[PDB]
Design a binder for this molecule. Structure first.
Ligand SMILES: *[C@@H]1O[C@H](CO)[C@@H](O[C@@H]2O[C@H](CO)[C@@H](O)[C@H](O)[C@H]2NC(C)=O)[C@H](O)[C@H]1NC(C)=O
Ligand SMILES: *[C@@H]1O[C@H](CO)[C@@H](O)[C@H](O)[C@H]1NC(C)=O
Ligand SMILES: *[C@@H]1O[C@H](CO)[C@@H](O)[C@H](O)[C@H]1NC(C)=O
Ligand SMILES: *[C@@H]1O[C@H](CO)[C@@H](O)[C@H](O)[C@H]1NC(C)=O
Ligand SMILES: *[C@@H]1O[C@H](CO)[C@@H](O)[C@H](O)[C@H]1NC(C)=O
Ligand SMILES: *[C@@H]1O[C@H](CO)[C@@H](O)[C@H](O)[C@H]1NC(C)=O
Ligand SMILES: *[C@@H]1O[C@H](CO)[C@@H](O)[C@H](O)[C@H]1NC(C)=O
Ligand SMILES: *[C@@H]1O[C@H](CO)[C@@H](O)[C@H](O)[C@H]1NC(C)=O
Ligand SMILES: *[C@@H]1O[C@H](CO)[C@@H](O)[C@H](O)[C@H]1NC(C)=O
Length: 750
DNA sequence: AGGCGTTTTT
DNA sequence: CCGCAC
């Protein structure tokens, strides 16, 4: 039986997904199909320029409708094609259940009439240039109104969006209003007193006063950032904040005593007025980024009163054309007792010392501290020792060079207690002295440095708690036998993209150190170009995962018996990646010399044209085999052998022409099978024995299927349509004639 | 005539 | 195969 909503896809929680099917108008569906069960209808990015009274009438319990991007204005059109969208008056009224509507990135100039059931309405990036009380008649349940970007550089209108005084007061439930990028020069008068979130960013409201926010006592979040911009920091087109602006009256925010978040970023602020923050005793988030407060953060008392503040963003508060020799934070910072998160990135200051952060040192909740992109070239890292609650320091993209004068394969540092990011700095060696006071560290990132050192066991001596060490994108020379043995708790070590030593033709390298790292569980040697003159064996009793991708086992395994047992000493290894190893061939003895313990083997993006499938019994525990991106011409040369434990098999992006009968039949555990992007002209139940109904996933997309009248595959795919992702739209015909490139369901074949 | 195309936010 | 110790 067919999929119930062609050409669209049924999904969980009653979602019918019609996205990206290039529809010229709204599909009505079959009258047999259960239009009652439909709670959400997605039509993202089709080309429906005309909506009608009948289009949603049969959908009697529709709660959500997304029609975004269907008829975008000239300015947001990839090729500046104009487009104006027509809506018959009862289009939406005929859906009295509708709660959420999205008409963004569509060419409409008036708001259509809408059912009183509506809770959320998104009109962003339209050409609606006015809102008067008649726009939103009888929407007494409406809580959300987003209408950003109806007049800006990418969707211009020649004037300002005019919202009439009092025009929204009819919306007594309204909590969220956003009117960004609308070329506004003043806040709309008399907005709903129910408002909790008022977002007015990237307009040109250069003046504010308490009259501009009258009766808005319910406000929890106000955003007025980007109204008076510093264009020296802009990535997009930008008009410079005029001379002697902006003007924010002292008491502007005083009646807003529920206010949790205030955003004043990119407002060209040279000085903070402590009266701006009087009365804001619920204030937990303050964004002051992209201002000119480099000098004001050394002196100001403006923070004194902010007992509840948790996140303070002071980033990109830099002085034009300069970095500072020194920076000393104001003593007032020391009263921010609730502070958890401080962003100081992009201020530009050359020295990080005891004096720089002294106020912050006894704040008991301070966990996250962002210090990146500051052109810092001296940094006493010992300053962080006695910070009571520190979990994360980002010191990346700085100029520090020393001490002062898939998580299957590589775990992240998120669940760990203390992480220092020193990546994208100028270290050429590692002096143990710079980490003397950081013995509590559990994760250290040192990637993208210039480390050209022959490490030997004496570089990281103090880091007695360190579990993860990322040294990717460096030039470590792996040669001495006791490198890293000084890190007693080391569990994960990333040595990827440290290729330059291994490119040194005629100079060999020694990986015997790996055997001396007794708790190492994860090791990456990826993208190192490892090809000749290296250790014959990797030995480790403890290792679980090894990313050996982007090397040339090809050249190693071509070189007599020298490297045939290369991975065999990894006695506990469960995951191995041998992808992009230029492998044109594999011996069955080479695969048998892999650890018996293996569960995941990747061989993606190699050049294998042949695979002796029987040799999979030499890996008893193998659950996942990835051969994507090879050149298999067929699934043949035996079948998947008896008793294999294989659950996942990916033979996508090969040149597979056919599959032998009974090929998967003996793979009793096989759940996911990817046959995508091959040259398969059919799909057959004969391939599976008669056990295809146990497959949870069967991807057969981008295959040049032969769409002939009464073809066997059509009936088959409907048998197991549960498991075929994208069946309604992305499984396509390669022949005959007219049908090439069109869906299998573009015409009924049965 | 309409087409374009997976488009975050700035 | 990179200051070892013919
Ligand atoms: C089956 O494999 C295909 C192709 O190898 C997957 O589709 C690709 O997905 C990746 C990321 O998931 C993208 O970078 C590619 O652009 C996609 N390519 C194509 C041609 O679609 C597909 O997602 C896999 N199937 C399953 C069920 O995971
Ligand atoms: C903003 O409004 C002014 C007129 O008040 C106009 O000159 C300018 O072009 C408008 N901006 C846009 C993007 O239309
Ligand atoms: C808000 O919506 C409710 C129903 O959810 C309705 O009682 C009323 O019209 C609105 N209430 C207020 C106080 O505005
Ligand atoms: C604030 O609310 C009252 C009505 O409750 C009204 O009289 C007053 O004009 C409002 N103020 C402004 C500035 O709109
Ligand atoms: C915080 O919020 C409540 C109302 O939501 C307000 O009445 C109270 O005065 C505020 N101030 C402080 C210091 O918590
Ligand atoms: C490592 O080489 C250094 C030179 O930086 C040398 O002083 C030291 O004795 C060697 N350390 C170990 C642990 O072998
Ligand atoms: C590699 O290092 C180990 C440990 O020092 C050593 O015993 C082995 O002989 C070295 N390999 C070569 C080729 O010298
Ligand atoms: C493998 O199968 C292909 C056909 O798919 C055939 O051409 C080839 O000779 C076979 N070789 C072996 C060794 O089974
Ligand atoms: C696979 O390898 C085994 C053992 O070397 C051999 O007996 C068998 O004939 C091979 N199969 C093919 C199709 O080459």
């Amino acid at each position: 039986t067919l999929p119930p909503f062609l050409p669209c896809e049924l999904q969980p929680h009653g979602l019918v997904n019609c996205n990206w099917l290039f529809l010229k108008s709204v599909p009505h569906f079959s009258a047999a199909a259960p239009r009652d069960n439909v709670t959400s209808l997605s039509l993202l990015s089709n080309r429906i320029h005309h909506l009608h009274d009948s289009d949603f009438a049969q959908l009697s319990n529709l709660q959500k409708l997304n029609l975004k991007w269907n008829c975008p204005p000239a300015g947001l059109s990839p090729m500046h094609f104009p487009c104006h969208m027509t809506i018959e008056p009862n289009t939406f009224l005929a859906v009295p259940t509708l709660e959420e509507l999205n008409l963004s990135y569509n060419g409409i100039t008036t708001v259509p009439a809408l059912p009183s059931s509506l809770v959320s309405l998104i009109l962003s990036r339209t050409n609606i240039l006015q809102l008067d009380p008649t726009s939103l008649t009888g929407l007494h349940a409406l809580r959300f109104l987003y209408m950003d970007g109806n007049c800006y550089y990418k969707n211009p209108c020649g004037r300002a969006l005019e919202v009439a005084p009092g025009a929204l007061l009819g919306l007594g439930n309204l909590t969220h209003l956003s009117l960004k990028y609308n070329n506004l020069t003043t806040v709309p008068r008399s907005l709903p007193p129910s408002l909790e979130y008022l977002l007015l960013s990237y307009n040109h409201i250069v003046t504010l006063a308490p009259e501009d926010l009258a009766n808005l006592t319910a406000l929890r979040v106000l955003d007025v950032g980007g109204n008076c911009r510093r264009c020296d920091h802009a990535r997009n087109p930008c008009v410079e904040c005029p001379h002697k602006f902006p003007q924010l009256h002292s008491d502007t925010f005083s009646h807003l005593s529920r206010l949790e978040g205030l955003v004043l970023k990119d407002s060209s602020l040279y000085q903070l007025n402590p009266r701006w923050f009087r009365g804001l005793g619920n204030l937990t988030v303050l964004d002051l980024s992209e201002n000119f407060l480099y000098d004001c953060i050394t002196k100001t008392k403006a923070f004194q009163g902010l007992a509840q503040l948790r996140r303070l963003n002071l980033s990109f508060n830099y002085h034009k054309k300069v970095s500072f020799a020194h920076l000393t934070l104001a003593p007032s910072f020391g009263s921010l007792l609730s502070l958890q998160e401080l962003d100081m990135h992009g201020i530009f200051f050359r020295s990080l010392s005891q004096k720089t952060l002294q106020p912050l040192a006894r704040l008991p909740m301070l966990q996250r501290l962002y210090l990146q992109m500051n052109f810092i070239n001296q940094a006493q890292l010992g300053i962080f020792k006695d910070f009571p609650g520190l979990r994360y320091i980002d010191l990346s993209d700085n100029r520090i060079s020393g001490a002062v004068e898939s998580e299957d394969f590589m775990p992240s540092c998120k669940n760990l207690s203390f992480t220092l990011d020193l990546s994208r700095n100028n270290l050429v060696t590692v002096q143990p002295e710079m980490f003397a006071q950081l013995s509590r560290l559990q994760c250290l990132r040192l990637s993208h440095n210039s480390i050209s050192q022959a490490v030997n066991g004496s570089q990281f001596v103090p880091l007695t708690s360190l579990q993860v060490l990322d040294l990717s994108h460096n030039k470590l020379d792996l040669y001495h036998g006791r490198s890293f043995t000084e890190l007693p708790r080391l569990e994960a070590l990333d040595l990827s993209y440290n290729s330059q030593p291994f490119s040194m033709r005629g100079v060999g390298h020694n990986l015997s150190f790996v055997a001396q790292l007794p708790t190492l569980r994860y090791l990456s040697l990826a993208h190192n170009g490892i090809h000749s003159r290296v250790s014959q064996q990797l030995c480790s009793t403890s290792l679980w995962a090894l990313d050996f991708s982007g090397n040339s086992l090809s050249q190693m395994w071509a070189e007599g018996d020298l490297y045939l047992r290369f991975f065999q000493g990894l006695r506990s290894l469960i995951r191995l990646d041998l992808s992009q190893n230029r492998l044109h061939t594999l011996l069955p003895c080479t695969l048998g010399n892999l650890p018996k313990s293996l569960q995941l083997l990747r061989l993606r993006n190699n050049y294998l044209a042949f695979f002796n499938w029987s040799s999979l019994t030499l890996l008893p525990n193998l659950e996942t085999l990835d051969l994507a991106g090879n050149q298999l011409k067929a699934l043949s040369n035996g079948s998947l052998p008896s008793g294999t434990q294989l659950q996942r098999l990916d033979v996508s992006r090969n040149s597979i022409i056919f599959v032998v009968p009974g090929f998967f039949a003996l793979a009793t555990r096989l759940r996911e099978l990817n046959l995508s992007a091959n040259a398969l002209r059919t799909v057959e139940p004969s391939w599976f024995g008669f056990l295809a109904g146990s497959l949870e996933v069967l991807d057969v997309s981008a295959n040049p299927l032969h769409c002939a009248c009464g073809a066997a595959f059509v009936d088959f795919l409907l048998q197991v349509q549960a498991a075929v992702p994208g069946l309604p739209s992305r499984v396509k015909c390669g022949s005959p004639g007219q049908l090439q490139g069109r869906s299998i369901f573009a015409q009924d074949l049965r």
